[PDB]
């Protein structure tokens, strides 16, 4: 299950930066720098519309990069705090299961490949939706419910 690699920033619960396929990626809104000197010296690219910051993974360590897919059938997917629901396109936690600091967590399917990265969410109890990024095979896209806040 926990067959996973990621790293945090500046010695706080500053969210995570994640090795997906062939590149390191991170929320653009989370502060500081990576708590791994091997990745910290990389030259990151960024977008303030996807809220995404990214760099190529160095050749000597690509075994640590997680599998990825665009494929998102409806059902349930898994992250740091266990299962999360996906139906009507709203990645949803059944009440309160996350809070600020819960940034950058990948969402993995039932075959252990990444579909999305978490950024934040919007409270409506059992209907609590997530702000995320996910790739439509060629291109990254940002999902965001109305009334969200960042994590």
Residues of the shown chain interacting with its own copies in the complex, contacts defined by CB under 8 A: 21-22, 56, 59-63, 67-68, 87-88, 122-127, 129, 145-147
| Nearest CA among 11, 79, 15, 9 for reference residue 39 | 9
Q: Among residues 40 and 61, whose Cβ is nearest to its own copies?
A: 61
Q: Order of strands, edge to edge, in the sheet holding 23-27?
A: 6-7, 17-20, 23-27, 52-56, 45-47
Question: What is the closest distance, in whole angstroms, from the C-beta atom of residue 114 to its own copies in the complex?
Answer: 11
Q: Is 64 an active-site residue?
A: no
Active-site annotation holder among 9, 102, 103, 131 = 103
Active-site annotation holder among 51, 102, 109, 131 = 51
Show the tokens assigned to 58.
Answer: 């160095």
The sign of the dihedral angle between the CA atoms of 74, 76, 5, 96 is positive
Question: Do the Cβ atoms of 107 and 117 come closer than 8 Å?
Answer: yes
Q: Which pairing describes strands 149-150 and 114-122: parallel, antiparallel, or unpaired?
A: antiparallel
Q: Among residues 10 and 38, whose Cβ is nearest to its own copies?
A: 38
Question: What is the closest distance, in whole angstroms, from the C-beta atom of residue 58 to its own copies in the complex?
Answer: 8
Q: Is 29 an active-site residue?
A: yes
Q: Among residues 82 and 125, whose Cβ is nearest to its own copies?
A: 125
Q: Is 51 an active-site residue?
A: yes
Enzyme catalytic residues = 29, 51, 103
């Amino acid at each position: 299950n926990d067959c996973i690699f990621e790293v945090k920033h500046e010695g706080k619960v500053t969210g995570y930066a994640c090795l997906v396929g062939d590149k390191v990626m991170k929320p653009a809104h989370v502060k500081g720098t990576i708590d791994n000197a091997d990745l910290a010296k990389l030259a990151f690219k960024r977008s303030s519309k996807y809220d995404l910051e990214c760099a190529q993974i160095p050749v000597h360590m690509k075994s640590d990069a997680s599998k990825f897919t665009h494929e998102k059938p409806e059902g349930y997917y898994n992250w740091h705090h266990g299962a999360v629901q996906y139906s009507g396109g709203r990645f949803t936690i059944p009440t309160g299961a996350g809070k600020p600091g819960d940034s950058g967590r990948p969402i993995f399917d039932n075959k252990g490949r990444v579909v999305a990265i978490v950024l934040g969410g919007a409270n409506e109890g059992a209907r609590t939706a997530l702000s995320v990024v996910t790739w439509n095979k060629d291109i990254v896209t940002k999902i965001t419910p109305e009334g969200a806040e960042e994590w």
